[PDB]
Design a binder for this molecule. Structure first.
Ligand SMILES: [Mg+2]
Ligand SMILES: [Mg+2]
Ligand SMILES: [Mg+2]
Ligand SMILES: [Mg+2]
Ligand SMILES: [Mg+2]
Ligand SMILES: [Mg+2]
Ligand SMILES: [Mg+2]
Ligand SMILES: [Mg+2]
Ligand SMILES: [Mg+2]
Ligand SMILES: [Mg+2]
Ligand SMILES: [Mg+2]
Ligand SMILES: [Mg+2]
Ligand SMILES: [Mg+2]
Ligand SMILES: [Mg+2]
Ligand SMILES: [Mg+2]
Ligand SMILES: [Mg+2]
Ligand SMILES: [Mg+2]
Ligand SMILES: [Mg+2]
Ligand SMILES: [Mg+2]
Ligand SMILES: [Mg+2]
Lengths: 119, 38, 249, 162, 198
RNA sequence: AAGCUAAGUUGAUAAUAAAUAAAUAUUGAAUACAUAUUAAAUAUGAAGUUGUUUUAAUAAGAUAAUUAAUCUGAUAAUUUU
RNA sequence: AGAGUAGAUAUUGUAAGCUAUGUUUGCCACCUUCGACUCAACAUUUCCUCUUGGUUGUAAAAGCUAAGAAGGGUU
RNA sequence: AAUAUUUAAAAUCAAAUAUAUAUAUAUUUGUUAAUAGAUAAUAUACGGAUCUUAAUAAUAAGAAUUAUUUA
RNA sequence: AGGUAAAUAAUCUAAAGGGAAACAGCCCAGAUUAAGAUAUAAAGUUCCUAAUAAAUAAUAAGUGAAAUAAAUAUUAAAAU
């Protein structure tokens, strides 16, 4: 009411592009972690780096966090996500049950990917 | 002229009109049904 | 004959078109204006006298306006000056008082050194009177309507009560020293300033005044006077511009 | 080293012509280009503390392009300082009162920087509704362009000056 | 499209020609626009008349059977085919004007309500009731005749002009529902209200 | 008596014109019909707008003279218009 | 929903619904003169004056209701 | 071409992922706009300019709005 | 309610610098001193003002363009 926190209700094209890149970067981090674990498993079994990378059979991670992060239904990749959920986040105190993801504190660091099926 | 945000057609002889960036209703039979979307 | 010059292709090949007329131009302004079809006179207010109608006995005040050597000096035109006007000179003056430049001007226009010079704007070219012609009081018709322009009397640094008719304050009931003052001159912090045009004490008078629809009662040439019903702005021996009325005929 | 030499050509105020009859850019875009020229950003010798601008002459402004209903709707404001004296004039009326080039002049003035150089850069822009201007000879021309121009047109541009 | 697709039958005494002008005028709108550079002229026994038409509309002749058709390039454009229909209607109306003519009958209902012609038949004076004289002067291409003071005939070759003049005359006194009083443009009538004085 | 003044005297309320608001119309489709148009064309319409009239300030422009015992101003003296 | 001799919509619109103002009475605690006289400037949510639509409920006159309208006026 | 709920990716349909090499299970995504309602008091306030494009037609403009995206 | 009472972060308090027009608390980032070549964060690239070229649809209302105003009404879009 009194203070002027002039935060617009919708993002711009540049903001959307940056958000897309950030999502992609997190996806890349997850992918690299899994690949490193796979190569480590191969090297422990005896193979070397070259055919560890070229191995037809890729070893899946055995930790809960990595397995869940790799499941698309838990942490969908950027290209899998919907345009709505790329930029809008779920709020139960807002008309339409949505708010711009840029109104979340520290939104460039924290990650949101999934909202309720019917919201 | 019934200037109102809700404009209907009461007499079957009412006809809609799009003039001056506004919606009008004119009735050929009953002149009471003239309306304007203000 | 031949000199070195170069032409830009853009300018050379530009298509010729005429710029439209803009309202803020002398031609359109002159067309719009409301001007008489005849020139007027310069006169010198001499004073006021009664006027008695011989037939009905009506008595009405009348100002006496002297016509003394009123001559047309030169003309103004639309193709040279942007408006149609007749410059008119009144009176006789002395070499010592007139300047060399204006002496040359009067000599060139073949007139004598003049007490006063002022120009009257006519509607078109039909109203321009030839230069050097002496204009007489009979230039106006008895019973017609003219407009008179002149500088009014000076009243000096006048207070708000006299200048704008403010009521002032009471003379009693505890009123303090400021009796003849205008009261408040603004509002609180919101404006924070006195708005332009606030009525305040200041010099009044010595200002041009145009009185319209003054009736010409009597005109005679053996005395060189013009009679105007009513009153004319300015003190005695003050110059007045008389010209046919624009509103009534 | 690059700076040592004859800078007289560099700091020369050329005269540029933009014929709105041929130009296809709209009012604002044309005005942005004109403002760039008047500021002098197009000169590699430009430094902010200096006024390196060039003269610009605009002709046939009566064919300027305006999109939408701006002509009948856009309003220009002016206020002396006395409350209740807010003049609001439509673009149509401003055009009928002061001409078409007045709109372009306002646009360029708005796009110019807000400095002591603003007005002297603005007066450097000459606008004419028609084609008749006194700066026909004050336009950059080269000897290698004269071939296309016919002789009578050259004679007209030379002898029939204002 | 149904209106504009109907052909036109032209008698031997009426001819229709189409040509272009020197100054194409281009009028603007939002995402659309129009360009007008053609003109159609209809000649007939009762004078000549003309219409302005865009470049996207063409007339197909047929001397046999005396038939002419009007068509545009692209009917997918609603803002084009509406103009096609309107231009068909206008040229047909002009053809009726030249071959036969357009007529309107004004009836002056009311006691003392009457019309007269003055100024060599140029001015029309109406007495619908006023302390001030009322009327107006006929435009070019329209001619007026009064068989009776209470009746008036306005006719010419341009339907729009004849009927606009008729309506302008009627504006002085339209019909009054309580008692029939005013100028009636044509056979059209009004419904009167009951007396039912309080 | 002069002057000032209103209780007195005189004049004015600034047109004609141009676009419009609400609103009243002609022809006319897309949409056989209908529709004044939030299509193309064609008209009416306000003490409001533009203007006009009146008074400030500006001087684009115009006439004239240009080193003068009567070229232009000022200081100075007698004063009010 | 109901009055309006008839008919919810000429006028009228009673519980409830959606909003607008920040002139009222309160609420918070960032920040510790009412009236009169004089002169008023601004807004329009127009009282009068101009243009206009509706009104078995506008025959005329006087009205009611509404649209444009802040130029002038408003003990 | 006419009677014509609803404003939808749940269900169906179409593209993609992970297991599957003659085919299936599971997962991810894709379902409307414009105007009116609109709203006060020193001064119009997207920060301002200004922003919608058009053949003939020149070196050379055609969102600077919204929604998905690319380099 | 820029209210009040406590519960998790974070910042101001005690934090300069970039963005949010201006801005204690929001987005990014923590000034030992310089230099100014490279990669940048948030935010942006018509001019004021450092920096951009495109694709596919929609808008015609200057709607909107860095503070989305509701019920409702009108006109338009396809599924059988
Ligand atoms: Mg007193
Ligand atoms: Mg005391
Ligand atoms: Mg005292
Ligand atoms: Mg005080
Ligand atoms: Mg029809
Ligand atoms: Mg009708
Ligand atoms: Mg008027
Ligand atoms: Mg009832
Ligand atoms: Mg209630
Ligand atoms: Mg109002
Ligand atoms: Mg009555
Ligand atoms: Mg699904
Ligand atoms: Mg405001
Ligand atoms: Mg608190
Ligand atoms: Mg800290
Ligand atoms: Mg402390
Ligand atoms: Mg800081
Ligand atoms: Mg910015
Ligand atoms: Mg800053
Ligand atoms: Mg806007």
């Amino acid at each position: 009411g009194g203070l002027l926190w002039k935060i617009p209700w919708r993002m711009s094209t540049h903001q959307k592009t940056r958000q897309r890149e950030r999502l992609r970067n997190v996806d890349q981090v997850i992918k690299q972690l899994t690949l490193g674990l796979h190569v480590q498993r191969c090297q422990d079994k005896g193979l070397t780096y070259q055919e560890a990378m070229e191995s037809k059979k890729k070893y899946k991670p055995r930790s809960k966090s990595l397995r869940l992060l790799n499941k698309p239904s838990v942490f969908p990749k950027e290209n899998q996500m919907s345009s709505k959920d790329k930029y809008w986040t779920f709020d139960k105190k807002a008309v339409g049950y949505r708010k711009g993801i840029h109104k979340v504190p520290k939104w460039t660091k924290i990650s949101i990917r999934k909202a309720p099926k019917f919201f | 002229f019934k200037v109102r945000t809700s404009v209907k057609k009461f007499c079957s002889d009412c006809y809609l009109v799009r003039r001056k960036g506004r919606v009008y209703i004119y009735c050929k039979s009953n002149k009471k049904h003239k309306q304007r979307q203000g | 004959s031949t000199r070195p010059f170069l032409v830009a292709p853009s300018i050379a090949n530009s298509i010729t078109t005429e710029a439209p007329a803009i309202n803020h131009s002398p031609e359109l302004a002159n067309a719009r204006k409301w001007l008489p079809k005849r020139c007027g006179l310069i006169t010198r207010k001499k004073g006021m006298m009664p006027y008695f109608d011989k037939s009905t006995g009506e008595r009405s005040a009348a100002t006496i306006l002297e016509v003394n050597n009123v001559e047309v000096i030169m003309h103004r035109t639309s193709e040279v000056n942007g408006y149609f006007a007749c410059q008119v000179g009144y009176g006789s003056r002395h070499l010592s008082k007139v300047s060399r430049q204006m002496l040359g001007h009067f000599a060139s226009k073949v007139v004598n050194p003049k007490e006063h010079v002022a120009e009257f704007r006519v509607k078109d070219e039909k109203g321009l009177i030839p230069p050097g012609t002496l204009l007489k009081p009979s230039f106006f018709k008895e019973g017609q309507y003219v407009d008179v322009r002149s500088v009014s009397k000076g009243k000096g640094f006048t207070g708000v009560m006299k200048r704008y008719g403010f009521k002032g304050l009471r003379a009693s009931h505890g009123t303090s020293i400021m009796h003849r003052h205008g009261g408040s001159y603004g509002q609180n912090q919101d404006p924070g300033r006195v708005l332009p045009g606030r009525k305040m004490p200041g010099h009044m008078g010595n200002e041009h005044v145009t009185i319209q629809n003054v009736k010409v009662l009597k005109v005679d040439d053996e005395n060189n006077v013009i009679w105007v019903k009513g009153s004319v702005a300015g003190p005695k021996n003050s110059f007045v511009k008389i010209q046919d009325a624009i509103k009534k005929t | 080293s690059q700076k040592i030499g004859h800078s007289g050509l560099a700091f020369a105020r050329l005269w540029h012509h933009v014929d709105v009859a041929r130009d296809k850019r709209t009012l604002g875009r044309l005005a942005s280009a004109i403002a760039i020229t008047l500021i002098g950003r197009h000169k590699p010798v430009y430094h902010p503390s200096q006024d390196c601008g060039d003269y610009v002459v605009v002709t046939n402004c009566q064919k300027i392009r305006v999109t939408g209903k701006k002509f009948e709707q856009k309003t220009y404001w002016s206020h002396s300082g006395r409350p209740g004296q807010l003049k609001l004039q439509t673009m149509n009326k401003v055009v009928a009162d002061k001409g078409f080039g007045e709109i372009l002049k306002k646009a360029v003035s708005g796009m110019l920087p807000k400095n002591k150089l603003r007005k002297q850069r603005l007066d450097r822009l000459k606008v004419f509704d028609g084609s008749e201007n006194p700066y026909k000879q004050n336009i950059t021309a080269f000897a290698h362009e004269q071939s296309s121009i016919p002789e009578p047109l050259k004679e007209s541009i030379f002898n029939q000056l204002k | 499209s149904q209106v504009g697709s109907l052909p036109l039958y032209i008698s031997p005494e009426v001819q229709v020609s189409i040509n272009a002008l020197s100054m194409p005028r281009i009028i603007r709108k939002g995402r659309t626009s129009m360009n007008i550079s053609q003109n159609i002229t209809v000649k007939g026994p009762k004078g000549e008349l003309s219409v302005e038409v865009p470049d996207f509309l063409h007339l197909d002749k047929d001397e046999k059977h005396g038939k002419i058709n009007v068509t545009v390039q692209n009917s997918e454009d609603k803002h084009q085919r509406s103009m096609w229909g309107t231009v068909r209607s206008l040229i047909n109306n002009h053809i009726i004007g030249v071959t036969e003519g357009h007529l309107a009958v004004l009836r002056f209902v009311g006691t003392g309500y009457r019309a007269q012609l003055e100024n060599d038949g140029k001015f029309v004076n109406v007495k619908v009731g006023a302390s001030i004289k009322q009327g107006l002067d006929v435009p070019e291409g329209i001619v007026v005749k009064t068989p009776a003071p209470t009746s008036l005939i306005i006719e010419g070759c341009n339907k729009q002009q004849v009927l606009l003049f008729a309506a302008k005359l009627r504006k002085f006194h339209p019909p009054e529902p309580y008692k029939g009083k005013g100028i009636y443009v044509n056979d059209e009538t009004i419904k009167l209200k009951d007396k039912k004085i309080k």
